[PDB]
Structure 1
Amino acid sequence: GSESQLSVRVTPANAALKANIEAYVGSLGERDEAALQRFRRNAEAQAEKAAQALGYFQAQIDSEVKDGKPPKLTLKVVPGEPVRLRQVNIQVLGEAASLESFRLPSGKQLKPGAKLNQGVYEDAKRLIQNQASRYGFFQGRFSTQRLSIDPRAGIADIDLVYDSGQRYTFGKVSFDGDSIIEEELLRRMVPFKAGQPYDSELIAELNQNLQSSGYFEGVRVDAAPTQQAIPVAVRLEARKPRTMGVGLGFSTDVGARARFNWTRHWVNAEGHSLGFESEISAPRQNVGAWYEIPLDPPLTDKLRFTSGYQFEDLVDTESKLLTLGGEWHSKRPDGWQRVVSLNWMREEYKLGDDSGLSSFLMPGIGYSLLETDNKVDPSHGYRLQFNVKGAKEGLLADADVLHVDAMAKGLTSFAGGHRLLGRLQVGGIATNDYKSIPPSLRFFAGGDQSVRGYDYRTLSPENSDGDKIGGRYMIAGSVEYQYPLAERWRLATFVDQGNAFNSLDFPSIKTGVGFGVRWVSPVGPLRLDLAHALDDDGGFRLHFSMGPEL
C-alpha cells in the first residue's frame, strides 16, 4: 500500500487553515498505530505553527489515533478568532518620500481588518530596506520598528517609520584592464552619467552591457558605497582575439548537420567585429562572412556587412545562391529591433528541369521583438518577426519584387505547469515575372517547424509534370499543448495547418495532427513527434528536432 491517512477537521470549516495544517504536518508515511502515537506531539506542534502563520493564536488543537487499513491520525481543531491588524502605520520619510519608483508596502495583507500573516511585517521591512539599498539611501535608518500583538482580543499593530536621509549619486567611472577598446566607446555604453541618482540596477545593466559586447572574457564592475558620490571601478580582461566553434545537430528536415564558426571579437579600438560561419548538411551547405561596426548606442545600434554562399538540393529544386549585404540595426527600449537593409543576390537555380539565373539588388526593412522568461527553460514568452524587401527591375533587378514574411511564436504556462504553444507564419511575394523568381524568394511548407505530418518543403504548388516549384503565398500555423510528466520531461499533443500556394482563392490548407515527447537532455531541448497527415494521402511521420522552443 500503504500510506497512513491524515484527516484534518476544522470546526467550522476553513479550507485555508486545513490545507496549511496538512502542508505543515506533512505526510504520515507508512506508520502503524504506535508510530502514529509517537508522532502526535509533532502533529499538534506543526498544526499550531500552521495556525499561527494564518493569524490564529488561540486554536484548540487535539489529536485522535485510530488503527485500521490504513491507520488514521485525525487532527481536530477549533480555530478561534484570529489576530487582525488594527493600526498599520508604514511611513517612508526623507528624500525617498518623493521618489516615484520607491514601492511602499501595500496590499490586502496590510489593510486594517486582515488576519495577520506570518512575516508580512518582515516582508514590508525587507522591501523598504531593499529599495533603500537599490536607490542609494545608504544612510537610511529605521527610526521605528514595531510589531505588536495581543492574541487575547486578537489585535495587532504595525509601526514602521523609515527616515531615508539623502540619496547618494553616481561618481566618476574608471576603466582599467588590457582592453584596447577606446574609452570613447566604453563610456557610451554606460547607462548613467555622473552626478545622476544612484541605481544598483544601472550598475547591473553596465555589467551586462560590457559582458554582451563580446569584447572581454571577464568584467569586474564594482563600487560599494564609499567616499555624496560613489565612484565606479570597472576592470576588463580582453577576450582571446580569435575563436573557433563547432556544433553537431540532427533534424528530420535535413538530417545530420555540422556547424562551424570563426569569430574575431575585436579587430580594432573602435570595436569592429569580424566573423566566418558555415553549415554542412546533405541537402544544404552554406558559408558566410560578416563585419560589424558599432554606431551609437554601441550595443543596440550597428552596421553589419555580410556575404554568403549557399547550395541547396531540396525536393525538386536546386539553387546556388550568392549574397552581399549591408544592414543597419537599431533597437528601441521596447525591445523592438529594426533592421534596415540593402542586399544584393545572384541565384543559379533549377526548378524541376527548368534552369534559370536571376539577380536582384533589394532594399528591406525588418522588425523583431523577443520577450521571454528565458533563456533555456522559458516558461512563457513570445517572438514577433516582420520583414519586407523589394526590387525594381531595371534598377539592378531581373524582375519586380515585393517579398513579405512574418512570424509569431508564443508560449504560456498555466495551472501546475501546463504549457500552450502557438505558432503562425505568413508569406507573400508580388511580382510581374514569376518565372524569373528563384527558389529562395518562393515559399514552401511542411516539416518539423512548419506543418508536421508532411516532409520538409513538400507542401508546394506543382507544375505540369508534378514537380513542387514553390508558392507565391504561404501560411503555416500550429497549436501545441504540453503536459509536465517529470522534471525535464514533457508530453505534447499538437495540430498544424498550412500550405504554399499560388492563389489566394485556393489555399488548399493541409492539416497534420499528432503527439510527441519533449526532453531537456544533456545536449539540449529534444523534441520527438509522431504526426498524422489528414490531407492528401496521409500516413504517419516521425519528426525530430532540437533547439529552444522560441
Structure 2
Amino acid sequence: GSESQLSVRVTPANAALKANIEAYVGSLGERDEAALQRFRRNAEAQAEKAAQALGYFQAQIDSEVKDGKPPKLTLKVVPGEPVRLRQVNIQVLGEAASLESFRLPSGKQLKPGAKLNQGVYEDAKRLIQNQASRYGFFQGRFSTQRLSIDPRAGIADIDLVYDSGQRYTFGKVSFDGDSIIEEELLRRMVPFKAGQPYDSELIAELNQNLQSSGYFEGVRVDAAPTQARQAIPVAVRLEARKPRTMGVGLGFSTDVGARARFNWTRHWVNAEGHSLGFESEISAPRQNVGAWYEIPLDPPLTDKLRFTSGYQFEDLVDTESKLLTLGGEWHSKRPDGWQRVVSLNWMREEYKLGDDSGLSSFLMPGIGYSLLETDNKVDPSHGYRLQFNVKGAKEGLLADADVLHVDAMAKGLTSFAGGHRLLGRLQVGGIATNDYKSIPPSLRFFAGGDQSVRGYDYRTLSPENSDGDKIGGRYMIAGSVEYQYPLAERWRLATFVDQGNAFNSLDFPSIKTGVGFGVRWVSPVGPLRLDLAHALDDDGGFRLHFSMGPEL
C-alpha cells in the first residue's frame, strides 16, 4: 500500500453511469487529503463529462473528501432524465450514395427517442469517413456535421450530410528497385487492374503479397492521393533480398523437447521467380532435413508448384524410422479460400516397430484441401481451419502394399462476451490396406500430446503388440474443447477436455480422456501454453504440457 480508493454513489442505481464515471475520473493514485481536495474540480468535471457522455445533462454532482488509511473521495451523482434524439438525418450523397457495401450509420443508438450516447455521432462520422477513405472518395466532404444539445427540454438533433464527390481509381503500377524479377511476374501478383475502383485494402493486399513472396527484404508500396476526376498512380519500390538468407530458431515442447530449426533459403534464382530452399530441424527424438524448389504459377502466391525431397530419423516410444521422400505438389486456391494441393509423393521407410524391423516403399498420389478463415495472424478474435488429405497406392505399381490413407482436421475459435474464448479441435485418421504389416509408422496413427490428447505423452496413445510395445493404430480420433477466461492483457486462463485414441477396430475405440487446466500467455512471437492435465483413463497421473505457436 497505499492507494486512495475512489467512491461513486449514484442515486438511484445505474451501473453504466457509475462505471463510466469511474473510467473518466481515473485512478486517484497515492494519497492525500490535500491532493484529493485539489483534484475535486477535476473529479466533478470528468464525472460530468461522463454524464454528458451518457445523455444526462441535468447532471448534478457533489464532491466529498474523507481521510484515513488510505484516503477516499466520495462523489455523489444525480442524473436528470436523459436527452433523447428528436431529429436524426444521416445522408451520404455523391457517388458513394450508390455503393453497395458502403455501410450507412445504423442501429438503436441513432434512432429517435434514444438517449444520446457519447460518440455515437462521432462513431457515425468516423464510419462514414473511414469507408469514404477505404473506397477512394478522396474528394469526399462533410457538407453538414451538426450535433445540437438542449439539455433543457431534453432534445438533441443529429445532422450528417456527406458529399463524397467523384471516386478516384487505380492508375499505373510501377516497379523500381534492384530486383531482377520480371515485371511479368510482379504484375501477376497485383490484386487489381488499372481503371479499377480504388481500395486501400487492395493496396495493403499488394504490399502483403510482395512481402510474402519472399523476394524482398523490403517493399515500399505507396499510393498517396492528389489534388482536385483523376487516377492515382501506384509506386512500388523493391529491395531485392540478400540472395541467400539464413535463419535459426530455438523452441521447446513437451512433445519433442528442446528443438532447433534452421533454414537457408534462396528467394529468387532467376527472373521468372523460381525459389530454392533448404531446411532442417533437430530434436532429441526427431531429426530431419529437407530441400525444395518452387515455381510460381498464377496467381504466384496462392498457386504454385513445389518439389521437395527429405530425410528424417525418428526414435519415439517403441518405434524407430529412417524415412526418405521425394515429391511434387501443385497448389491452387479458389476465391472461397479453398486451397487444393495435388501431389505425387514417393517414400521409402526403414523402420523398427517394437522388435520387428521392416522396410517398405510407396509411390502415392494424393489430393488435399485447406481452408483458413481468421480475424488475423497474431491472436485473432475468432476463426477456423479445415484440412482434408487423401493419398493412396496400388502394390506392384511402385508400392509394397495397397494403401488408402486419409487424414482430417478441424480447428475453431470464438470470442464472446467480454473476451471469453471457446476453442474446438477435432482430428481423424484412417488407413485402409490389404497388407497392414507392410505399413510403416508414417502411415500409421498415434495420439496423445500437446496438440492431440493432453494428459498423455506425445504419440503414446496407440495399440500394442504381444510384448507391450506401442506399434500404431489403423485409425485415430482426437478432439478437444477449451474455455479461455481473460485475466489480463496477454494473459488467459484455460480449462480443457481432450479425448482421443489410436486403435485398430472401429467397434472398440477405447477413447482415452484427459482433462485439465492451464495458462496462456501472448508473447510477440506467439501464444505459449502450459497445461496441467489429469488422465481419466489407463492409469492416469498428472502431466505438464508445454507448447508454442498460434492457437490455430
Q: 1:42 aligns to what SS in structure 2?
A: helix
The 2-side partners of 1:218 and 1:429 are apart by 45
Paired residues of 2:31 and 2:70 also in contact (CA < 8 A): no
CA 1:12–1:482 in structure 2 vs 1: closer, same or farther (change >3 Å)?
Answer: closer
Single out whichever of 231-240 and 3-12 deviates more from structure 2.
3-12
Residues in 1 aligned to 2:32 and 2:231: alpha-carbon distance in whole angstroms? 67
Structure 2 SS opposite 1:106: coil
Over 3 Å counting, the alpha-carbon distance change for 1:100 and 1:403 in structure 2 is same
In the aligned structure 1, how far is the partner of 2:528 from the partner of 2:13?
A: 47
2:145 partner SS? strand
Moved more, 51-60 or 366-375: 366-375
Q: Relative to structure 1, is the Cα distance of residues 200 and 391 closer, same or farther in structure 2, using a 3 angstrom cutoff?
A: same
Quote how far apart the aligned CAs of 1:5 are. Answer: 5.4
Alignment correspondent of 2:478: 476
Deviates more, 1:159-168 or 1:64-73: 64-73
TM-score (norm 1): 0.93
Structure 1 pair 132–456 and aligned structure 2 pair: CA distance change class (3 A): closer
* CA shift for structure 1 position 303: 0.7
The Cα shift of 1:130 comes to 2.6
Q: Deviations over 1:10-38 (max 9, x none)?
A: 44443322332232233445656665554
- The 3 A distance-change label for structure 1 pair 176 and 397 is same
Per-residue deviation, 1:56: 1.9
CA 1:252–1:159 in 2, change beyond 3 Å: closer, same or farther?
closer
Match of 2:99 in 1: 99
For residues 139 and 548 of structure 2, the distance between their equivalents in structure 1, rounded to whole angstroms, comes to 52
Which shifted more, 295-304 or 228-237? 228-237
Deviation of the 1:146 alpha carbon: 2.2
Partner Cα separation in structure 2 for residue 254 and residue 544 of structure 1: 10
Q: Quote how far apart the aligned CAs of 1:403 are.
A: 0.8
Deviations, residues 146-173 of structure 1 (Å, cap 9, x unaligned): 2223222121222222222221111121
Q: Closer, same or farther in 2 for the Cα pair 1:179/1:401, shift >3 Å?
A: same
- Summarize the Cα distance change of 1:481–1:13 in structure 2 as closer, same or farther, 3 Å threshold: closer
How many angstroms does 1:358 deviate by? 1.7
SS in 2 for 1:204: helix
Contact 2:297 2:304 in 1 (8 A): yes
Shift of 1:202: 1.4
- 2:493 & 2:110 partners in 1: Cα distance? 42
Give 1:50 shift: 1.2
Give the Å deviation of 1:2: 6.2
Cα offset, 1:231, TM superposition: 1.5
Query: What is the deviation of 1:445?
Result: 1.2
Q: CA separation in 2, counterparts of 1:69 and 1:486?
A: 28
Q: Does structure 1 residue 281 correspond to structure 2 residue 290?
A: no
- Note closer, same or farther for the CA distance 1:100–1:482 as it changes in structure 2 (3 Å cut): closer
Identify if the C-alpha distance between structure 1 residues 488 and 203 changes in structure 2 by more than 3 Å, giving closer, same or farther. Answer: closer
Classify 1:346/1:139 alpha carbon distance in 2 versus 1 (closer, same or farther; 3 Å). same
- Tell me the CA shift for residue 240 of structure 1: 0.8
Structure 1 residue 189 displacement after superposition: 1.1
Distance 1:85 1:423, change over 3 A: same
**How many Å apart are 1:181 and its aligned residue?**
0.9
- Kindly provide the CA deviation profile for residues 412-451 of structure 1, in whole angstroms up to 9, marking residues without a partner as x: 3444444333222111111111111111100111222222
What is the CA deviation profile of residues 257-278 of structure 1, one whole-angstrom value per residue up to 9, with x for unaligned ones? 2221111101111111111111
- Mapped to 2, the partners of 1:36 and 1:258 lie a distance apart of 56
What is the alpha-carbon distance in structure 2 between the residues aligned to residue 486 and residue 85 of structure 1?
A: 37
Counterparts in 2 of 1:225 and 1:15: CA distance versus 1, 3 Å:
same
Cα distance in 2 between the residues matched to 1:210 and 1:523: 22
Q: How does 1:67-78 map to 2 (within 5 A)?
A: 73-78=73-78
Deviation (angstroms), 1:486: 4.4
User: 1:32 matched to which residue of 2?
Assistant: 32
Residues 44 and 363 of structure 1, relative CA distance in 2, 3 Å threshold: same
When structure 1 is superposed on structure 2, of 219-228 and 151-160 the one drifting more is 219-228
TM-aligned CA distance change 1:110 to 1:460, over 3 Å: same
**Deviating more after overlay: 501-510 vs 395-404:** 395-404
Q: What's the CA shift string for 1:345-370, capped at 9, x where partnerless?
A: 11122222222222111111111122
Relative to structure 2, which stretch is displaced further, 231-240 or 114-123?
114-123
Cα deviation, 1:182-203, whole Å, max 9, x if unaligned, reads 1111111111111111122211
What's the % identity of the aligned pairs? 100
User: In the superposition, relative to structure 1, how do residues 131 and 519 fare at CA in structure 2: closer, same or farther (>3 Å)?
Assistant: closer
Moved more, 30-39 or 268-277: 30-39
Distance 1:211 1:339 in 2: 23
Q: How far off its partner does 1:468 sit?
A: 1.4
Range 486-495 or range 500-509, more displaced: 486-495
Q: Please name the residue that 2:342 is paired with.
A: 340
| TM-superposed deviation, 1:488 | 4.0
The 1:35–1:298 alpha-carbon spacing in structure 2 relative to 1, beyond 3 Å, is closer
Root mean square deviation of aligned Cα: 2.4
Please give the alpha-carbon distance, in whole angstroms, between the structure 2 residues aligned to 1:131 and 1:487: 30
Q: In the TM superposition, what is the alpha-carbon distance from 1:67 to its structure 2 partner?
A: 6.1
Distance verdict in 2 for CA 1:511–1:250, change over 3 Å: same
Q: Which moved more, 1:468-477 or 1:313-322?
A: 313-322
1:520 offset after TM fit, Å?
4.2
Q: 2: CA distance between counterparts of 1:199 and 1:317? A: 55
Instruction: Tell me by how many angstroms 1:397 deviates.
Output: 1.6
Q: CA deviation at 1:301?
A: 0.6
Deviating more after overlay: 453-462 vs 273-282: 453-462
TM-score, length-normalised on structure 2?
Answer: 0.93
Shift of 1:335: 2.5
C-alpha displacement at 1:6, in angstroms? 4.6
C-alpha distance in 2 between matches for 1:231 and 1:38: 56
Q: Measured at CA, do residues 457 and 138 of structure 1 come closer, stay the same or move farther in structure 2, by a change above 3 Å?
A: closer
1:153 counterpart SS class: helix
Residue 333 of structure 1: CA displacement? 2.9
Any idea what the Cα deviations from partners look like across 1:218-274, whole Å, max 9, x if unmatched?
Answer: 111222223721121111111111111122222222222222111110111111111
Deviation at 1:493, TM superposition (A): 3.2
* Matches of 1:250 and 1:9, distance apart in 2: 52
CA distance in 1, matches of 2:379, 2:190: 30
The separation in 2 between residues aligned to 1:53 and 1:11, in whole angstroms, is 18
CA pair 447-187 structure 1, distance change in 2 beyond 3 A: same
Secondary structure of the equivalent of 2:453? coil
Q: Do the aligned partners of residues 29 and 134 (structure 1) sit closer, same or farther apart at CA in structure 2, a change above 3 Å counting?
A: closer
**How many angstroms apart in 2 are the aligned matches of 1:437 and 1:406?**
19
User: For 1:27 and 1:278, how far apart are their aligned partners in 2?
Assistant: 52
CA distance in 2, matches of 1:394, 1:8: 82
1:524 Cα deviation from its structure 2 partner: 5.3
Deviates more, 1:177-186 or 1:26-35: 26-35
1:442-470 deviation line (CA, Å, top 9, x unaligned)? 01112222222222222111122222111
Aligned length: 550
